[PDB]
Every structure is written in structure tokens, then in C-alpha cells.
Amino acid sequence: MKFAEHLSAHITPEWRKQYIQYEAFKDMLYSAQDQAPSVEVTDEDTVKRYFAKFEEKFFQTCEKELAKINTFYSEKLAEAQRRFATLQNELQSSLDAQKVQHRNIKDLKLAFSEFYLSLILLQNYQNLNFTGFRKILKKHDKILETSRGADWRVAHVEVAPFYTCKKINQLISETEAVVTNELEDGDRQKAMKRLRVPPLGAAQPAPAWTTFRVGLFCGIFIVLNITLVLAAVFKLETDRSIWPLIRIYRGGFLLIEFLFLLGINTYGWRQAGVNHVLIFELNPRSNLSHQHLFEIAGFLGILWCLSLLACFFAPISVIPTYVYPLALYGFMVFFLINPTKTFYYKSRFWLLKLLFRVFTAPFHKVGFADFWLADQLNSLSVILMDLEYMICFYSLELKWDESKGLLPNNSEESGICGVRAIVQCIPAWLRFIQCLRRYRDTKRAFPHLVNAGKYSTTFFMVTFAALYSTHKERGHSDTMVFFYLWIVFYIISSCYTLIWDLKMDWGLFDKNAGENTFLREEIVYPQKAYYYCAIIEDVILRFAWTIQISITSTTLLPHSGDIIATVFAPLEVFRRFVWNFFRLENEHLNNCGEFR
């Protein structure tokens, strides 16, 4: 509960291999002390010899660590000096060409903010490495009852060209002078507000009020869920179709679950070290922690349960029950498109810019955030089918003349209410067109043309499912050829998406696995059982995702298809939750998508 965990939490994740390696030294010291011979059953000269050999070993490995740190610091400082040179040349060129321009100035501001962050990170590297050297030499002096630790400290560590190099501080002062004089016309307060680096990474605890709001929204949600179960068992009339209600309130629940699991994903990414900040292109001084995602999910789930309870209980008699789902989803939309500057404005508007860039995306160049949201839409595809069902049900099947709305006595439609497939492929189409744009951009046909057929398989599966459904509904003869076609494309799609998940989305099953059998060379998440369980769960849940797509866009299994979809949709959201971890891990470790 000291500098070991302080070091693990304050390490820059991409430079983890070039730090002090505190725990190795600690284990070396403890093992040396443990296997020390006796003091009177053995010879004292042998004890002196053993302790001298251990001292030699310790100082050899300490010299190796110091050399590593010096090499890394020299490389990084040279890089920063070159970056400052080119940035000053760019600013000089832009400002003398000044006598568009706004975009140029914004990009210069952003480049100077990222140059400052690298300097701050290198400074923190220096500080942590020096403090780790002092603490471990102190532990050596304490464990062995000697003074060679502080001797080696004063002799070697405080001469090293990484503790005596006051060149990063000059660079920081120079950068501040540049940003203040040439980019802000004085006004150092505004420059430093843009340049100052808050304690980042796993090194910040969320405000107590955010955690209290998480806990408050979670308790209300829990009690309202208990109340929903009790009101479903004891208050729903036993002569009405509750299935329209289930279909309407299914998409909201999937959204709440997705936000909860995204919060858990953010916690795992922040803890294991894989920084979604650099991959998503978020600014490192302001991100959403897992607490904010948990709070958003809890609020939206509170609203969901309140609307469902109002549907079950019908509190007031003037307003019919179909207003409650409308109200819930209208508030959900008004939360997202809130034009004021309140309630997570930066996050919501980043998300809206992303949604405009994924729903119109043969024209925008694909980043990682444009790809992850279009991949997450594949799991949240039942939300679009729920929206289409809500529109169809309110336009064609709701009476509007009786307060008892969503729950009708007995009546149906042709299927359930063509355009129930198109709205299943929509996200597959987005990802297909994005992969095509990426191929056109990079001209590298392997990762992009492959992974475009990955979604053409979904296209073909939905098409042939719908064809066989309509042909078995009207009792035709060429129905069997279509059933075999659908089964072959189901197998093809399941294996295609399964191989891509494990091979070049997660990186697993590589030739250089080493001792991590069937895994990557370097794993980030602690337990090895996490990866094997994830493999098994993805194998199970990937096959029971194409089945749901086939059964949602069809008319077969009318009674059991809805139970199937209701059970399998949160399972698919959980599958995407599991997929996020290892996709993000294999993007930090190896560009898997060639972004960056």
C-alpha cells in the first residue's frame, strides 16, 4: 500500500517496460533474505560470502536498470527537441503566411497542447524513476543492515543524465512562452488553462458526489426492478398481449445494459492500462470515467423503470398508457440533443458528431471512434428494430380511442407490427461502406476488403432468411433450396465473424504465443483464465447472434421467436462488452486496424 502501487498506478502505460521494475528488486531482496544460511550452524565466512554475492548481483541489475532509463530518456528528449523544432517552423510559416486560418490556429493550439503533454509525461517519468531508486536502495539498506545502498545512490543515480538534465524544464518554459506570446496575445491565464495537465490515468479518484449519484441511481433502480417484478406477478391483467409492451421496452433496456457494460469496459481499460483516450482521440485532460457512464446508465434506467411501472399501474386515468413509452424515448432523445451546455455537453456532442460521421460514412475518413461505434451498432441492432416496431405499432395498430393502449385484447398483423430486414442490415451496411472507404484510403486490400465480406455475409443471411420465410409462408416449392442457402450462409457468417473476432480483432492465436498458450505474446489483463473464458463465451454467443438476426427478420417461430430475441439480445450486448476489452487491448499492443 505504498510506492509499489503508487508506481503501478502512476506509470505511463505505453512506457511500462522502461520503468524501474520495483517489484522485481523487492522479490530479489526478500528471496535473498529468505534463503540466507544459518549464523551458527554454518560458517560466518560463508554468510559473508553469500551476502557479498547478493550485493554484487543487486548492484549489477541496478546498473542495468539505470542504463535502460538513461537510454530511454535520451531518446525521448531528442524526440521532443526535434518536435519543438518542427513545431516552431510550422508556427513561423503559418504566421508569416498570415501576412481555414481558424482551422490552422486550432490545429496549432492542439499540437502545442500535445507537445506539452509529452514533456509533462517525460518529467513524471524522471520523477518516478528517481523516487523508485531511492525507495529501493533504502529497502536494500534496511534489509541488509548496510550503507552501500545510499552510497550507490549518491555515487551513480545523482550523476546520471536523466536526473541532472534540466532541459525538459527549459523546453516547458519555452513552450509556455510561445503559446502565450504568439497564440494568445498575452493572456497567460488562458494559455496555461489550455496547457495544464491534470493528474491523469488511474491517478485520479472520481468526485465523491459522482460516486454518491452512482450509488443513489443504482439503489433506486434495484428497488424499482423488484417492484416491477412484483407488479408483473400481481397486477397485469391475464387477458391482454403484453408482447407489444415487451417489444417497445426492450430497446431501452438494451441501451441501459450497453451503457453499464461500457462503464465496466472503461474501468477495465483504465485499470489494465490500455488507454482508450489515445485510441479514441479524446483529450487527456478531460475524459469520462466509469463513474460517469454508470451514472448516465443509472439515470436512464430509472426513467425506464418509471415508465414501465406507469404502464403496469396506470397511475392517472386521464392520460392513456401509450404516452409513457413515448415520453421515455422523447426524453432520451432530448437528453442527447440537449442544445444547452448542461448534463454532459461535451460527451453528448462528441457522440452526436460521431453519429453524424458514422451514419453518413462513405464521405468521412474512418478513425477508431467511427469504427467502434459502427461495430457497437451491430450489437444494438435490436434497438433499431424496436424503433421501427414502435413507429409501425403507433401508426398502424394503436387504437388511440381507448386508454388501454399498448395492451390490446387480441389482434395481429401480417407478421409482426420487408423494412424489418433493411433495418437489421443498416449497421452492417454502415460498417461495409466504412471498410470500403478504408480500402480506398489506404489501398491495402487485406484488412479492409476482407472485413467487408464479413458484413456481406450478414447481408446474404438476412436476405435468404427473409426469402425463405416469405416462400414458406405462401407455401411455395422452391422453399427448400432457400432453407439450405440460409443454413449455409448462417454457418459462413458465424465462422467468418468468429475467426475475425479471435484472429485479428483480439490478436489471439498467434505463432509467438510463448508460455501464454493460445494467447498473444504479451497479455495486459492479469488472469489467463479471462482470455480462455472469453474465447469460449464468444464461440457460444457468436453463434447465438446470427440465429437471432435470422429469427428477428422472418415470420417463422411466431411464438418462440420473441422469447428467443428477448433472451438473446442482452446476451449479444454482453458479447460486445467482452469483445471491447480485447479489441482495445490489441490496438494498444499492436495497431490491429492500422489507425495511427
What features would you describe in this structure?
With 596 residues, the protein is an all-alpha fold. It folds into 2 domains: 3-197; 203-588, no CATH class. The chain has 21 helices and no strands. The chain has helices spanning 3-9, 22-34, 44-97, 101-144, 148-156, 168-183, 188-195, 208-235, 243-272, 276-280, 290-313, 323-336, 345-358, 368-379, 382-397, 422-442, 445-449, 453-473, 480-504, 529-552, 558-588. Helix 9 (243-272) packs antiparallel against helix 11, helix 9 packs parallel to helix 21 and helix 11 (290-313) runs antiparallel to helix 12 (323-336). The chain is globular and about 95 Å long. Keywords: Cell membrane, Disease variant, Membrane, Phosphoprotein, Transmembrane, Transmembrane helix. Phosphate binds at residues 375, 378, 454-455, 542, 575-576. It is a multi-pass membrane protein. Residues 343-360 dip into the membrane without crossing it.
